[PDB]
Symmetry: C3
Subunit: 182 residues, 3 copies
């Protein structure tokens, strides 16, 4: 009954389409959003659905004062039926592949119950995307079982035109929906 | 004559028992403590032994103004006969495995004279502990020669009950003591 | 006609010789500098050539306000014919090997067009240099095709005397020059 979907934004310029992405899921599922500090540089709070709760790192160090209180990264990991990171920056990709967790989003990933699906939609410039570490990290996510929603060939924020643009919201949406109903 | 023991705390909620941990070593050895910024969220200065000097990242960028001055992370690495990190967060674990050093504790580890013993007592939620990166990183520490003091099955700060709680101070203490006297 | 050389400084105490390093290149090439936040602890702006433009992380989040604006890390990657990091700290070395990018310098590396040469001059204490991760990371840079300019045996900022001091500016300069003219 109304699947819980955790949507997340990383520090990619593509984060400007995050509000719209949340809109694609709202009717179908109960949505909660998580963003990194850098994503707040491209994300516009008012562009998100009003029904969507936005969590930041500060929410981590606030929902807990003394033992016994809830641990947000754990609370969200449990609450969620699925996790979608769109966009996923090269930086966050590398932290995931490195087993690092220095913020709310990465802590959720580090404690992620892999029985639940986790989708990522990478977004970065072509050179960063073509860089060898990208494939290295993607290979790692595959091993973890994370599902990749490949970037498309659009007009990058850097003027040029090539691979690296984030997948379109509709595709991200249908991909997650088709899997769930399977 | 009175071994020098460097005790360290990472950003795990278990850091609340750090003062007590220092107490377990004070009589047997000369103790100096090192903590990460996040550990200061769970650590209570007044709970530590008065004879214990606490070093923070700020102490790094203070003991040095111009060439010729001492480099704290190096000064501590030399001073210490042994290093004990309890608790060791998943984040710090990953930085160690990644050869990273962006703070006092990690810089000490990065420059650690592995002729000297280094013990770690991991502390994190069960899912984070059960996460595949954990084992990956533990494997790396093993190669480096670091000694693992496994977490126990207690009642986590997240309410649930499972593996991931930090080893008890007494065990951490006896483990380090038994090795030394060998 | 006047090759574009991007010179970069990391958080090594050796960064105090960065201004002089820029001077070694100024006559031969058009120089632009990039520095990390920590490098600013050892770098003296007034010691650099006046003709040298210095870029910091803040320049990233300033040259861009809305879509369509230039992305500095990409703009610099394109502009540059070669990249030289001297000094390269153990921390930045590890971020490079980890495919991480959380600042201007690392983002440039992450998006680096490897058709262009990239040289690094590591600088760190002997123990950090002798640490096993160092070799591990150097091995990775080799695979990427990055050219290592080994550290020398001088008197470290830590008083002792051993390997780990940054290569001398003249050598860094001649190394880059000899390659270019080949
Ligand atoms: C204008 C601009 C656009 C950027 N675009 C991207 C991008 O598309 N993908 C990416 O991975 N990083 C991009 N970066 C770099 C990231 O913001 C940077 O690596 C950051 O530390 C990522 O933070 P996060 O890992 O918390 O998301 C951009 C930076 C700026 C200033
Ligand atoms: C209330 C709360 C409790 C936490 N408990 C743990 C824990 O037991 N183990 C862990 O590895 N991280 C834990 N985290 C996440 C870390 O604090 C976070 O990854 C941090 O960046 C670690 O910093 P450090 O690597 O400098 O220690 C907790 C966070 C909060 C807000
Ligand atoms: C006085 C002093 C000197 C340092 N010297 C070095 C050095 O030679 N090499 C190194 O890798 N780190 C050195 N460190 C540690 C780095 O500054 C630290 O790892 C930092 O986070 C690196 O930042 P960066 O990766 O942005 O350059 C030193 C720290 C201090 C306080
Ligand atoms: C930015 C947007 C959403 C505009 O339609 C699209 O181009 C995109 O997703 N691009 C991928 C990231 C990027 O451009 N990076 C640029 C430098 S690292
Ligand atoms: C917190 C304490 C010391 C109370 O006795 C004990 O439960 C413990 O070491 N737990 C391990 C870490 C943890 O609970 N993480 C929770 C979420 S990441
Ligand atoms: C600092 C300088 C430039 C003085 O001539 C020289 O010794 C040097 O490059 N040393 C390498 C780094 C170092 O000393 N690290 C010390 C602790 S991590």
């Amino acid at each position: 009954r109304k699947p819980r979907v955790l949507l997340a934004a990383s520090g990619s310029v593509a984060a400007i389409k995050f509000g719209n992405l949340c809109h694609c899921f709202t009717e179908w599922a109960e949505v909660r959003a998580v963003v990194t500090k850098s994503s707040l540089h491209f994300l516009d709070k008012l562009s998100l659905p009003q029904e969507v709760t936005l969590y930041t790192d500060e929410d981590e160090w606030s929902s807990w004062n003394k033992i016994g209180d809830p641990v947000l990264h754990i609370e969200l990991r449990r609450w969620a039926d699925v996790l979608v990171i769109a966009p996923l920056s090269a930086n966050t990709l590398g932290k995931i592949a490195g087993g690092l967790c220095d913020n709310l989003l990465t802590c959720i990933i580090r404690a992620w119950d892999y029985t639940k699906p986790l989708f990522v939609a990478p977004a970065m410039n072509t050179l960063m995307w073509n860089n060898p570490f990208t494939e290295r990290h993607l290979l790692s996510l595959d091993e973890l079982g994370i599902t990749l929603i490949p970037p498309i060939k659009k007009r990058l924020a850097s003027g040029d035109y090539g691979n690296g643009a984030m997948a379109e919201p509709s595709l991200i949406y249908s991909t997650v929906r088709l899997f769930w109903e399977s």
